Amino acid sequence: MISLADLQRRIETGELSPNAAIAQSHAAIEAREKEVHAFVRHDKSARAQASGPLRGIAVGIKDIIDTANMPTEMGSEIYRGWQPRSDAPVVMMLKRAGATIIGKTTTTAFASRDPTATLNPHNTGHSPGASSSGSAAAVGAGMIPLALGTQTGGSVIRPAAYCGTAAIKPSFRMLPTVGVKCYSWALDTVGLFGARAEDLARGLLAMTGRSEFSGIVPAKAPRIGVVRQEFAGAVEPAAEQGLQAAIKAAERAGASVQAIDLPEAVHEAWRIHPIIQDFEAHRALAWEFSEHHDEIAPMLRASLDATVGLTPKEYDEARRIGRRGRRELGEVFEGVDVLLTYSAPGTAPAKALASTGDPRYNRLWTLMGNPCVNVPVLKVGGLPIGVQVIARFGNDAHALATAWFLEDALAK
Amino acid sequence: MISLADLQRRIETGELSPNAAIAQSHAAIEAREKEVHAFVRHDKSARAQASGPLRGIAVGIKDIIDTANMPTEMGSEIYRGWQPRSDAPVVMMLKRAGATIIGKTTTTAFASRDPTATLNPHNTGHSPGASSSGSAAAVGAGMIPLALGTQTGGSVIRPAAYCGTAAIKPSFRMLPTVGVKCYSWALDTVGLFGARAEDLARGLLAMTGRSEFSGIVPAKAPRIGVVRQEFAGAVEPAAEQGLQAAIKAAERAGASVQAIDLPEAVHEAWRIHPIIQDFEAHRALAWEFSEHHDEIAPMLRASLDATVGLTPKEYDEARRIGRRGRRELGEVFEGVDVLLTYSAPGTAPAKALASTGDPRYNRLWTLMGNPCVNVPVLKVGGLPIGVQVIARFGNDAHALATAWFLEDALAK
Numbered sequence: 001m002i003s004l005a006d007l008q009r010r011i012e013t014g015e016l017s018p019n020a021a022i023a024q025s026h027a028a029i030e031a032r033e034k035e036v037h038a039f040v041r042h043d044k045s046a047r048a049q050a051s052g053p054l055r056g057i058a059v060g061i062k063d064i065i066d067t068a069n070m071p072t073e074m075g076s077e078i079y080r081g082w083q084p085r086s087d088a089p090v091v092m093m094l095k096r097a098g099a100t101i102i103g104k105t106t107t108t109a110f111a112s113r114d115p116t117a118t119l120n121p122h123n124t125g126h127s128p129g130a131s132s133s134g135s136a137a138a139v140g141a142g143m144i145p146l147a148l149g150t151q152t153g154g155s156v157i158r159p160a161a162y163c164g165t166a167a168i169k170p171s172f173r174m175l176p177t178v179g180v181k182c183y184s185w186a187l188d189t190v191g192l193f194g195a196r197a198e199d200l201a202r203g204l205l206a207m208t209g210r211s212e213f214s215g216i217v218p219a220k221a222p223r224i225g226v227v228r229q230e231f232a233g234a235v236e237p238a239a240e241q242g243l244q245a246a247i248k249a250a251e252r253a254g255a256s257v258q259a260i261d262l263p264e265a266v267h268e269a270w271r272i273h274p275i276i277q278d279f280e281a282h283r284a285l286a287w288e289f290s291e292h293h294d295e296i297a298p299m300l301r302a303s304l305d306a307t308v309g310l311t312p313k314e315y316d317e318a319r320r321i322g323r324r325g326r327r328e329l330g331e332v333f334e335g336v337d338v339l340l341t342y343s344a345p346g347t348a349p350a351k352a353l354a355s356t357g358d359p360r361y362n363r364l365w366t367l368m369g370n371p372c373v374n375v376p377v378l379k380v381g382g383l384p385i386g387v388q389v390i391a392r393f394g395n396d397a398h399a400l401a402t403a404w405f406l407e408d409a410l411a412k
Numbered sequence: 413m414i415s416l417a418d419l420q421r422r423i424e425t426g427e428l429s430p431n432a433a434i435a436q437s438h439a440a441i442e443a444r445e446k447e448v449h450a451f452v453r454h455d456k457s458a459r460a461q462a463s464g465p466l467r468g469i470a471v472g473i474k475d476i477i478d479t480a481n482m483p484t485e486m487g488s489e490i491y492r493g494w495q496p497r498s499d500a501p502v503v504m505m506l507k508r509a510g511a512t513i514i515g516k517t518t519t520t521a522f523a524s525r526d527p528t529a530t531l532n533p534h535n536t537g538h539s540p541g542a543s544s545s546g547s548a549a550a551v552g553a554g555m556i557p558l559a560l561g562t563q564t565g566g567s568v569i570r571p572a573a574y575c576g577t578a579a580i581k582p583s584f585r586m587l588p589t590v591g592v593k594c595y596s597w598a599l600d601t602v603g604l605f606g607a608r609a610e611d612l613a614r615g616l617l618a619m620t621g622r623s624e625f626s627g628i629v630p631a632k633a634p635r636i637g638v639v640r641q642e643f644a645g646a647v648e649p650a651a652e653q654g655l656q657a658a659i660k661a662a663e664r665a666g667a668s669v670q671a672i673d674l675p676e677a678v679h680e681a682w683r684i685h686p687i688i689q690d691f692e693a694h695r696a697l698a699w700e701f702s703e704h705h706d707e708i709a710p711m712l713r714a715s716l717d718a719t720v721g722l723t724p725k726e727y728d729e730a731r732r733i734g735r736r737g738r739r740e741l742g743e744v745f746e747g748v749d750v751l752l753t754y755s756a757p758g759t760a761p762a763k764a765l766a767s768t769g770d771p772r773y774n775r776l777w778t779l780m781g782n783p784c785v786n787v788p789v790l791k792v793g794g795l796p797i798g799v800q801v802i803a804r805f806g807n808d809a810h811a812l813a814t815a816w817f818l819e820d821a822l823a824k
Contacts, residue, residue: 068699085494092698178594178696185588210724284590286504287480312622 001165002028004057004145004199011056018048018056022100025058029102029143035124037117038138041070042103052098053206059094060105060138060147062131065190066179067091067101074181075107075116075131078288078295088179090148090190090207097206102144105134110285111150111183113356114297120163123382126348129159130356132193136163139193146203147193152183152277154344154362156191157388160374161343162357164384166403167193168200170396172369175207184280186319187273187366197373197403204396212397218408219401224250225260225336231267232360236346242377242385243342246406250340253409260339262332269325270364275318277363278307322367329368330392338402339390343374347383361388371396373403377410413577413607414440416469416557417614423468430460433468434512440555441514449530450540450549453482454515464510465618471506472517472550472559474543477602478591479503479516486593487519487528487543490700490707500591502560502602502619509618514556517546520768521709522697523562523595527768533575534794538760541571542768544605548575551605552796558615559605564595564689566756566774568603569800572786573755574769576796578815579605580612582808584781586620594696596689598731599778609785609815616808624809630820631813636662637672637748643679644772648758654789654797655754658818662752665821669752674744681737682776687730689775690719734779741780742804750814751802755786759795773800783808785815789822 002025010016029042040063048056066072066084073079091101106116108131118133120126121141128137132149139147140163149156151169160167168191175190182188194200198216205213226247228235247257282289282304288296289304296304332339342361349355365372365388373389389406391399414437422428441454452475461467473479476486478496485491503513518528520543530545532538533553540549544561551559552575561568563581572579581603589600606612610628617625638659640647647655659669694701694716700708701716708716744751754773761767777784777800785801801818803811 068703079497082497085491086699086703089695089698092702093695096698096702173597176594176597176692176695178597182588182590185585185590208724280588283501283505283588286501286508287498290504290508291480312620 001139001142001195002145003195005202007057007145008053008202021056022046022048022058025102025144032141032143036119036121036137036141038105038134038141038143040073040104040106040134043070043101046100046102048100049098054094055098057099057146058102058144059099060103060135060144061091061101062135062149063104063107064111064150064181065091065148067104070104072104074110076109076297078292084179086179089176090180093207105132105138105147107131107134108356109297109300110181111152111155112297112300114299115354115356119351120348120383122164122384126350126383127162127356129162129348131155132159132191135193136160136165136167139163139165139195145194145199149191149193150180151189151191151362151366152187153366154359157362157372157374158344158357158359160193161386162348162384164376164379164386165193166196166200166376167191167374168396168400169366169372170204171371171394174396182284184277184284186276186280189366196407197400200373201400216397216401216404219398219405221254221256222250222338222402222405223336224255224257225332225339226257227260227262227339227341229270229341229361229364231270235342238380238385239342239344239346241380243387246340246375246377246387246410249409250406253405260332263328265324265328266364268321269367272318272321273363273367275310275315276322276367278303279310279315282308282310326368333392337391338399341388341390343386343388347380347385365390369393371399373399375403375406413551413554414557415607416611419468419557420465420614428468430462430468434458434460434470437470437514437556444553444555447531447536448533448549448553450517450546450553450555451515452485452518452546455482455513458512458514460512461510466506466509466511469511469558470514470556471511472515472547472556473503473513474547474561475516475519476523476562476593477503477560479513482516484516486522488521488709490704496591498591501588503591505619517550517559519543519546521712522593523564523567524709524712525715525768526709526711527766532760534796538762538795539574539768541574541760543567544571544603545768547605548572548577548579551575551577551607557606557611561603561605562592563601563603563774563778564599565771565778569774569784569786570756570769570771572605573798574760574796576788576791576798577605578608578612578788579603579786580808580812581778581784582616583783583806586808596692597696598688598692601778609787609812609819612785613812628809628813631810631817633666633668634814634817635749636667636669637744637751638669639672639674639751639753641753641773641776643682647754647773650758650792650797651754651756653792655799658752658787658789658799661821661824662818665817667817672744672748675740677736677740678776680733681779684730684733685775685779687722687726688734688779690715691722691727694719694722738780745804749803750811753800753802755798755800759792759797777802781805783811785811787815787818
């Protein structure tokens, strides 16, 4: 993988020129697209901008995110050739900072469960996850130093983990979802994919200009609360192996680690996530479902058909539960600075399974809204396994600092 | 004006056919559109649907709200001919209820301050308000039974008052803002225009299927708390006159009315509405501001140019203050059922003033998120004057019931 922060530093000291950096990404992409298939379209003509902290940085944009110079096909045939008039605010955040939009990455149809043609860079016979398949795989395959994705269920943390890349789903609503094809407005959150926690920090810094993302440094003696989300069900061995390797590393590095069971309210919030997600999806995708029902990819079309009956009453009850969930989740952070849990059920499933991977270990957090960061830990049978770092809502900066601490801890 | 609740009943018994109802609207629009200019586009072939609670109901759609069969030009040359791919979820809510989308109604450039060419239905020499001027003017001219607008500052309640029509800016986020050109995601709220409070109730019921809107009836002896929003300065005579008239009619109808103060926290929330709005605006209209600066309407271009320096720091501060206002505001609702205040500074400004009217008496409530309902009180110089009924967040049903109550009390 390519380091965003690395590029910046090298470019800043004349050691490396933006054009060279961009030419390198163009090369890398071409070097493996025939294998990875992470891009829906690659703008071979894209070039480095003249100024800005992100000048010379190539970025992939999940194809449910509006671009004015390239089509945004939503990973659906319904939007084949569709050309938005403007760039989504998040794309402009990157351009204004000097980034180069090198292409649109593959996304599942409307960012749901329907598998794309993208393959995991580590093992072609396995899925790159979903729905930001392209973005994760592209960064994982060392094609680009950064990529934008989105998470409603677990399409940022999971695929990053599956592809061994660092990634962050900032606190809910920090990054605007304007010009981002909506699945569930109460959940949809923009995310970033990079090589390490530091790269994600530099990315957010350039995009937002928020000082908390400036000069972030690895945390010291973090207070970690380990939650295994028993309510989400049985986890796969490889996933537990990584979590334990992470815990052991964090301890040697000086962290204080203690296991903790999340409150009943949180378990409940985890349960009703589908209700909130699916009820809104019917409203958010009303047009598609009503006028092009059959044109909707099979897996998405099925979950919608099965949930057309959800009522506003049970939807409201789900949101009450969600709120209690957030209320009591905050309490937990009175003792620890961050929570550590699984980033996925296990190693990325083989493409033959036609499964994009269960989001059960990701969904709760998208609903709670807290910033989540995936930390690559190890590989089993060649496929990556990571762990998820979660901080108090609005404390993205600390989540990244701790994730960073964790990265250094694992490197011994 | 045309009553949706009225047409509904006549169509339900069989007295009126859906086709005849729609033929009615087409005629009403044809009869006054040339002098009022409320529609950007009138789909003359819009036909009635055979079923649904809104069959036979024609609706005007503010032109920053996506439609698949008609252009959505954001009231800006920048989007001339722009054709959205899908209908915004809210449009689909109406269509699924059996309604007829009869046209797109004029909007100010990106729903801001820049005046449109639409005229007030009560005097062609004044402003229909803004930015949902078209939607308000059309309902006010008796062209259509219902219309969708939006409010970031006061574009629903104010133009409603100016045009003398009932209207409601529902609880923040009840109606999705997907496919709704964003100005401020923390503020933007969809709203409805209709003849009377009952018509708004019926519309929301058909749109949301929420039981709270089913069976709504005039409130009895409501506990009303009067708030003059002193923090925004004094209002114009006509406005204060309408308020005094509203209070007398309420008291005479058996309602207990008491002057009340808003917590300093709330006053502060009003004061920082602009920071949250304009900061987010720079983010939501980044593309437009960067790529088409000079094509942006004068007034909007100036306000943006004047706020380019708003920082994330002062933005976060503003929000924290906004969150405190909401909390303490809810408290004010422990002793009273609804609040009564001004809907606008005064009667509609003369076209010569090139102003859409000050939103100062509407902006706070948009930030707080409470449901607000405009109730036409009287007329000064022929220009309508209304009052604003405000209930607790999530109590849209009560806000409509009290509004209905106030309507009856006024009719004496």
